[PDB]
Design a protein around this ligand. Structure first.
Ligand SMILES: COc1ccc(-c2occ(C(=O)O)c2C(=O)O)cc1
Ligand SMILES: COc1ccc(-c2occ(C(=O)O)c2C(=O)O)cc1
Ligand SMILES: COc1ccc(-c2occ(C(=O)O)c2C(=O)O)cc1
Ligand SMILES: COc1ccc(-c2occ(C(=O)O)c2C(=O)O)cc1
Lengths: 317, 318, 317, 318
């Protein structure tokens, strides 16, 4: 029996018997993703090249305008904006959204996969809404996920009910549910990080990669894959198993991926799908943030691969 | 003044003073690429999942095959998907030979990684009945070669004697728009690209070159690493940003792993026409003479300074 | 403020504080409309013609399966099905839908405009659902409308709040609201019927048309338009005003157009937009049906034009 | 065996051993048509309504003009949208004259009625500097003519000396697929098409002919009536289903209202190449020599038996 993203979101909203704001939110966000997707695949590029006589800025505008006009949000934090955006009073609702509107576009000149990452919170205060309202830890997420603009476009949605993957059918502009209640493999065969930073690696990371290239017990070495686009690397880890790493080194004691709108949503999707995500010291979702653009190390993926990483991590104290 | 793939192809045909076959060929193939692109982005997938109640690389291979045959411009077609060369039936014969990988990367297309189509075109070097031998030319004889990348958008990269040209597919009207004329690769890049999970098996020269990239001698910054696992995506990133790509010969695979006729050769041609290099380690990829249509070959390609810096290490190890 | 069909439908349901069923029904039905539109415009036709080596059945299948899987319906009446379909128990909801999945399709070989017509009732009886639940008169309609696949694709949705027109953006698969709370002109300058039936016309119809071609007063005669596709002619009548006729003659004392899934929805759209729709003797929404595929004559459009006709019909009565 | 418009036009151009100009022309016009179709179906309309925070007939005329100019195949362009003929600048000139209605039916596009692009192509008949004089040839001089209908689907109908061929636009891939080879119209149809609201102004011959269709003398069934009000839609139905279409001369309009160069002539040429007829009443439409580019002409076209039966009635009334 066929199911769409919009009908799935509408039913989950019906069962919660809430105000309906989170339903309007997710429908607004899904509409923005379809618009971004069309723009990313270069619809209308012929007009810019004279047939009749910016992508990360346009994407950021779509998500902002779609979220504001949903009447479901009060605080908006974006990778593109130095400060939180406070939704005007007439359009305020009770949700806080952190998003990276087009992750990976720094390298979009080469047509690498790009994505939209988001995490949604309920306001935990009563005062006038502020940047403070988005400084909740990952565990407080009500929903998170991403849209991948790869060889095709898929939205991956995480809630307490689990992870569901919807494929965008461009013929009709509808997200079709294609993978229900996804669970990640217990252990994978692929490891993923930028190894050009090897001279700066934490010594514990240096051993784990050694263990992947050179296995102790007669096993085959892991394959290496690193697209350089987080949504692409994390989705492949979800589909094929394995591990993804962008860790803390000494030249970067807090990693480089941003916590509120990259590490937390991916960590949340990973945990709801039977996987793990750690800074190294604590679970990613247990970090309490003090600044909306602060960074965080992240190692996520199949539980056996993250555990094996943690087994080695404690060997270096 | 606006320029499309069709306008570019018709204009180059005028300058070549030919029969017009290669123009129908490139136009037919470009039509197959539009159909592949549509299937890859999952048009009609709602019908597979029950809205009203064939694998992609088999579909891709059929699109390319049927479009090329029906161009009346080919005689021998070599495909990654077919163990033997296809001999185009006589009433549809033309003078060109086409080697192609109809959907390179599809081993990992389940994760929505970038995938592509790769192609290389030769002029038939015979008068007799056409045969598999007509595809056993080295890359240097290539008349036209390139790829379509099905990435964040769909781009066709077309390399000929006049140089490398990049066309963007506008899905609203199904047209390849020329967006980069006469492309050239940076002289030297800051990214290196290969699968390091095979590190225990590396040639000692490869092990040193990667070591030189992570730990630079002259106190410079180390290179960044990228490896998508899909050749078209990695090669294209190498063309746009410069850098180096490696799927080299090790000992356990003395001939590399990538296929020569429809992966190494088409990519080598694009690289050389764009001011870059592509080497097996011992000779330039385009100078290898093939003895089998599916034979493998090592490949190291990219910005000219990086392949030279690699060959210096390769020759230091005699 | 941007407004989509999805936002419009959800907002009306929120204010009504109902079960949420009618919202998923209309959302499911609109998805079926997007799929029909893609098929009508011949997407993928290159595969039927050998690039790699039924239309009104496909449409009926889309509306059927999409309505069933919405969990909001119990009885489905289709122009394509001889008897009413009773949705199986585990998928039942409290609504009844009469629909024409591809009206006009006999002339689709010439690429004339075609359409999808629908009307929605609430189950009124207390029994097990049955064909009787669909034999309500038009006045009991909860919602009705059409999709027109013309030069572009538009969904026209009429409810108690009035008539609203939504334009399908194929780049993103979204119905964009483009005409809020539309009303038909008091009097138009176009009349629409098949004048090849002239020898069989009711004597009152023959006089009314004569009045349009040869005006009694100092006025200009009406222009004539007849596409032959009910959705197309009815939409032109809403946009530009005027009158549409498919009346009772001698060969068909009950006309030819079907009451439940052609005459009723159009009459409901017409009335909610300030127009009228009459059989000649009674208003279309006042006919009590005894068989789901029964016919009814129809004269609809601007009220002054329907009235002027009714003055003539009673003169012959 | 599958054929596209692009393959078909390139193959016919090869067979004619011509300059390639008409090939460049039709490919540019077909590209303009795909872009028109995308806008007509309201692609991107969400952006005008604030999703992120120019009328169809002006855009169509601008698309067709720009594609034709930049094809290097034309010198004079006549459009319903332009008061005087357009003279293509010297550096972009070629030998063809094109008369077109860029978005016929668009006065009522608010009701989403089917609309279309109509076009006719002549060879320049002078050696002088090109001018409006070059567009005043009769229909018999037509080299190619036809239309694109933006209906329930988008179809391009192309008529040449080789006959009439119909191409369906596959929006999934942006390609015109050949779906109807060498089309021929019924000898006699069962549908008549005109605006009968103008009844008080009819020519007495039209009044009798229409009377004969509603009330048949020879005891046959009466004809059906269809009139979309959009020439391309009504003419296309007459081609696919047979029958007769009329926009004739009355007393208040002795020349009808449809324009001769870019509505009557192309439809007449398609009609004749497809085994049908098209008359002013007095002469065949293609035999009229025009004196002004925006001049009107009466037209009765369709199946040969129906136009003949009408002419018998027309000659009965002198
Ligand atoms: C799409 O799944 C959903 C949608 C909405 C909810 C939801 O739960 C409590 C709500 C509240 O109003 O407090 C609320 C909402 O409507 O904002 C839950 C899941
Ligand atoms: C697309 O650019 C082109 C097109 C055609 C050619 C071309 O050169 C020699 C030809 C020959 O007939 O021998 C020939 C062709 O027409 O097959 C070269 C480049
Ligand atoms: C399109 O907007 C809507 C959505 C829902 C309704 C609606 O009104 C009463 C309902 C009921 O439960 O009886 C009901 C529903 O939810 O079925 C009305 C308008
Ligand atoms: C679409 O099929 C075609 C294409 C081209 C032609 C053609 O015939 C004579 C030409 C000339 O240059 O005089 C000419 C052309 O190339 O303009 C004929 C049919």
């Amino acid at each position: 029996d066929v199911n769409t993203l919009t009908r799935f979101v509408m039913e989950e909203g019906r069962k919660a018997r809430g105000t309906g704001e989170l339903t309007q939110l997710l429908n607004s966000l899904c509409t923005a993703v379809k618009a971004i997707s069309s723009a990313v695949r270069k619809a209308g590029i012929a007009h810019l090249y004279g047939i009749a006589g910016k992508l990360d800025v346009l994407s950021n505008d779509l998500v902002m305008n779609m979220l504001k006009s949903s009447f479901a949000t009060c605080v908006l934090v974006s990778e593109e904006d130095k400060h939180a955006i406070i939704v005007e009073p007439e359009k305020r609702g009770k949700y806080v959204v952190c998003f990276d509107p087009l992750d990976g576009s720094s390298n979009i000149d080469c047509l690498v996969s790009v994505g939209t990452i988001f995490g949604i919170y309920r306001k935990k205060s009563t005062d006038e809404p502020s940047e403070k309202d988005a400084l909740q830890p990952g565990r407080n997420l009500v929903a998170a996920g991403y849209a991948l603009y790869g060889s095709a476009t898929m939205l991956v949605l995480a809630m307490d009910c689990g992870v569901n993957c919807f494929m965008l059918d461009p013929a009709i502009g509808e997200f079709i549910l294609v993978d229900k209640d996804v669970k990640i493999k217990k252990k994978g065969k692929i490891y993923s990080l930028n190894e050009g930073y090897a001279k700066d690696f934490d010594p514990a990371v240096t051993e784990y990669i050694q263990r992947k290239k050179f296995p102790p017990d007669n096993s085959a070495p892991y394959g290496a894959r690193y697209v350089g686009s987080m949504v692409a690397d994390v989705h492949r880890t979800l589909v094929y198993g394995g591990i993804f790493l962008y860790p803390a080194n000494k030249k970067s004691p807090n990693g480089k991926l941003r916590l509120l709108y990259e590490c937390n949503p991916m960590a949340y999707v990973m945990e709801k799908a039977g996987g793990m995500a750690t800074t190294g010291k604590e679970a990613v979702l247990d970090v309490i943030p003090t600044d909306i653009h602060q960074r965080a190390p992240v190692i996520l993926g199949s539980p056996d691969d993250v555990l094996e990483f943690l087994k080695v991590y404690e060997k270096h104290s």
